[PDB]
From a paper:
To understand the molecular mechanism of colistin resistance and structural features, here we report the X-ray structure of the C-terminal catalytical domain of MCR-1 (aa: 219–541, MCR-1C for short) determined at 1.45 Å resolution. The protein was crystallized in space group P212121 having one MCR-1C molecule in the asymmetric unit with a solvent content of 42.5%. The structure was solved by single-wavelength anomalous scattering (SAD) method using the anomalous signal of zinc ions with well-defined electron density map for all the residues in the construct. The MCR-1C adopted an α/β/α topology with seven β-strands, sandwiched between two layers of α-helices. MCR-1C consists of three disulfide bridges as revealed in the crystal structure (shown as ball-and-stick models). The Cys414-Cys422 bridge stabilized a loop (aa: Lys409-Glu423) located at the top of the protein whereas Cys281-Cys291 completes the catalytic site by locking a smaller α-helix (aa: Thr285-Met292) to the central β sheet. In our study among the three identified zinc ions in MCR-1C, two of them were located at the active site and the third one located near residue Cys291. Similar to LptA and EptC, the first zinc ion (Zn1) is highly conserved in active site contacts and is coordinated to residues Glu246, Thr285, Asp465 and His466333444.
Based on sequence alignment, MCR-1 should be a phosphoethanolamine transferase, a member of YhjW/YjdB/YijP superfamily which catalyzes the addition of phosphoethanolamine to lipid A moiety of lipopolysaccharides (LPS) and therefore confers colistin resitance to its host. MCR-1 contains two domains, one N-terminal transmembrane domain and one periplasmic C-terminal catalytic domain33. The newly identified mcr-1 is a mobile colistin resistant gene and has been shown to rapidly spread among various bacterial strains through horizontal transfer and assisted its host in colistin resistance.
Author numbering: 219 to 541
The structure:
Amino acid sequence: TIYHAKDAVQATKPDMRKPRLVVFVVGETARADHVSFNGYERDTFPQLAKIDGVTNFSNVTSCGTSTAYSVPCMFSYLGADEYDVDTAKYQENVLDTLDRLGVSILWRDNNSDSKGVMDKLPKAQFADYKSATNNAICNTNPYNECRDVGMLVGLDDFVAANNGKDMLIMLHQMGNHGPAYFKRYDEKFAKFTPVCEGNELAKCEHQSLINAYDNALLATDDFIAQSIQWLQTHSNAYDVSMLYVSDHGESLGENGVYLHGMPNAFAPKEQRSVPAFFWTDKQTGITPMATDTVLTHDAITPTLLKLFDVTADKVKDRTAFIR
Ligand SMILES: [Zn+2]
Ligand SMILES: [Zn+2]
Ligand SMILES: [Zn+2]
């Protein structure tokens, strides 16, 4: 493979300082402007609003507008201005670097797959959580659809199997993917009604489409809160943190545009303006950047490296989500 960080050094090791345990929630289809913290007039993140140490970032722009385009760029060394979607999977990415330096990498997926990101690493480090084969939380809704919270089940066994190592766990959400937003959340999150149901989105009033979308965000609030709560159970033995970033936003009819995937040359703001959250325990010494920092997906790679005390020449000048 073609390297970007052959020089990378982990300055400190888990045998000499506390091991570090991080969950990176790779979000899906979530819009910054539907987040309460960014000024949305509905409380779409009530559980995160009750957790001390959550930072919300109000100015984050995605690389692109589809999962296929954005996800590889989120883990790239190139940044958005330089990213090449066709050669991305055959170049060293940030997970390759962290794995080489001894961080135990796990990717659980309730979306599709890692879009090439995990391809160079052992197959055992990727797990499909879209089916009842691996996901124990699919029977809670009329659609028999497997839920993102299912990805948390059994993570204590992974920690036990990597006892005392640094660990980075990616949880790739179904999140707010459409067009059937109403299917994305269990009935306990049907806060905003009426909702757009059925297979004909044009038959639905705009407000009912928004309602379904916002209900799906409530389920994501819950998932991120449960991810933090899970991390908190390991805080004595590990330095624990959680990063959340959505891969792109979503058009909900603005200017006659729906869904996502619009080429960047024409993409409206709602497809690229994404939420991002960072949480850490007080013991870690990790400090968030200012909430209004002008940020992009280019911040992800340097954040992940910084979380594990890794430096790489190519990202020296790059702003992260953390100091
Ligand atoms: Zn990018
Ligand atoms: Zn999509
Ligand atoms: Zn996506």
